[PDB]
């Protein structure tokens, strides 16, 4: 779906620069899945931070 207006995706990228596009896509796909469990059509920071927490290491 789409990112909420106040979302900050360009925050996950600034951390340990050098993430393959694949990982970025996995994170986004994972965030979208989390929004779905909330019955929301928009992605919030929590979805992004959570998605990142389990796609990086």
């Amino acid at each position: 779906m789409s990112l909420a207006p106040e979302a900050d995706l360009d925050s996950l990228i600034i951390r340990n620069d050098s993430l393959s596009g694949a990982v970025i896509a996995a994170i986004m796909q994972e965030a979208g899945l989390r929004a779905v469990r909330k019955n929301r059509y928009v992605i919030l920071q929590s979805d992004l931070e959570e998605a990142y927490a389990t796609q990086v290491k």
Partner: protein, 226 residues
């Protein structure tokens, strides 16, 4: 499921009046993400709904209303960019703690800067917002201003804000490292030439700021100017 909240996302004013009139206890009800109606009206810049809701929240300190991610309506406001909404939320009886951090440890200033909202960032700083709160990755707003390559923000933070300039993040990067990794040659030299940024520090992989340059053109330009 959360009618009022929905009305706020869609900016259905007449709808908000109606729902609140019927069940006043909905003003501060939190939805599935821990948000109250004000989080959403602010998120979608519904100026009328926001004012209306605030008129009913005179006793409220926004610091007591972080959503599930730790974001208060004020963090949301600073991230969206509208100076007028931020002002509205600020000029109330009780004032928001300008340094309140989210669960990732970020402040409102981190948010406005990363999105390049100059006016909002200037407003926070002019009212006392610290320019050195370190988030979970040990980055301060300057780390973000450099990565987006905003000269305007770098001077605001290092000038008016007297920001620290050589702090290194969890990755070992100072703001300079960020400017060069993203191809912002002029912001990089601005940090070195005007605000005394050191370019001899090395990150956790032994690299120096000039060694993480987007390409050896930015690299060349930088060295040719510091």
């Amino acid at each position: 499921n959360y009618p009022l909240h929905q009305a706020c996302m869609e900016n259905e004013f007449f709808k908000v009046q109606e729902l609140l009139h019927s069940k006043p206890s909905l003003l501060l009800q939190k939805d599935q993400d821990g948000r109250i109606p004000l989080h959403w009206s602010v998120s979608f810049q519904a100026h009328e709904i926001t004012s209306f809701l605030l008129s009913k929240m005179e006793n409220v300190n926004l610091d007591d209303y972080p959503d599930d991610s730790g974001w208060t309506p004020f963090h949301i406001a600073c991230s969206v960019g509208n100076l007028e909404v931020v002002k509205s939320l600020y000029d109330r009886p009780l004032k928001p703690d300008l340094n309140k951090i989210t669960n990732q440890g970020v402040t409102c200033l981190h948010l406005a800067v990363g999105k390049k909202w100059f006016e909002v960032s200037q407003f926070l700083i002019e009212n006392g917002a610290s320019v050195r709160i370190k988030d979970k990755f040990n980055q301060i707003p300057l780390h973000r201003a450099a990565s987006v390559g905003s000269l305007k923000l770098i001077e605001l933070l290092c000038g008016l804000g007297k920001s620290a300039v050589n702090w290194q993040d969890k990755q070992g990067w100072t703001p300079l490292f960020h400017a060069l990794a993203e191809g912002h040659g002029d912001a990089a030299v601005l940090l070195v030439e005007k605000y005394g940024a050191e370019y001899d520090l090395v990150d956790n992989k032994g690299a120096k700021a000039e060694d993480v340059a987007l390409n050896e053109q930015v690299k060349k330009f930088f060295l040719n100017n510091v």
